[PDB]
Amino acid sequence: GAMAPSYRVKRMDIAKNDEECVVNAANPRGLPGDGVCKAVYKKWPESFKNSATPVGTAKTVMCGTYPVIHAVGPNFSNYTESEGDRELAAAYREVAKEVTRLGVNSVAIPLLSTGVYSGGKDRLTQSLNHLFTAMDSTDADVVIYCRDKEWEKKISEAIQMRT
Ligand SMILES: OCc1ccc2c(c1)CCO2
Ligand SMILES: OCc1ccc2c(c1)CCO2
Ligand SMILES: [Cl-]
Ligand SMILES: [Cl-]
Numbered sequence: 001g002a003m004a005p006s007y008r009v010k011r012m013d014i015a016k017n018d019e020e021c022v023v024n025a026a027n028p029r030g031l032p033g034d035g036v037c038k039a040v041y042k043k044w045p046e047s048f049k050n051s052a053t054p055v056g057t058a059k060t061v062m063c064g065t066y067p068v069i070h071a072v073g074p075n076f077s078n079y080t081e082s083e084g085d086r087e088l089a090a091a092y093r094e095v096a097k098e099v100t101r102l103g104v105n106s107v108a109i110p111l112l113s114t115g116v117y118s119g120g121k122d123r124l125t126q127s128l129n130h131l132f133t134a135m136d137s138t139d140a141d142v143v144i145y146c147r148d149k150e151w152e153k154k155i156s157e158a159i160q161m162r163t
Helices: 036-043 081-102 124-135 149-161
Strands: 007-011 022-025 058-063 066-071 106-109 141-146
Touching (some): 007 149, 022 036, 058 081, 066 081, 124 141, 124 149, 141 149
Parallel strands (some): 007 141, 022 066, 022 106, 106 141
Antiparallel strands (some): 058 066
8 A cells, every 4th residue: 555645636648647546537338449448459459359348347457567448437528417426426336346455555547538538528536536426435546637726726725725
């Protein structure tokens, strides 16, 4: 575990992370995808061997010894707000199981269902709060990766609000 498990946020490409494993914002089919998923495919293409897994689940595939945790958030275009909320909570609970199983001391994690799967809504708070609910009981250092300058500020404020 980490010395003093922390949350941090960085505004940069998760494919450049400095952590012991990465969480992909995957699609259920293990396809290269777009956004975070395509960055992950370019950097760790070997990790897409038999990476297909259902919505609300996570499936780890090793790229060398580097673990890629393929987490499948719901596409809110297709799910109801209620069912999508359940599946998004579930995906992060499966990430926490994988992070624990792997024995890593740090993980790089994107905000699931906030991009193309957001159904055109701002889900920063929804996605981050489900991230915290899952990861709070883990002792890995968590580094959240985002693209937008205003999102960085809001995620940082949310982390600091808990102290
Ligand atoms: O698409 C690659 C990429 C990802 C995050 C990010 C940047 C680029 C600039 C600021 O943060
Ligand atoms: O612009 C697409 C994109 C790619 C990688 C990545 C992000 C976005 C946020 C953190 O990591
Ligand atoms: Cl997304
Ligand atoms: Cl972002």
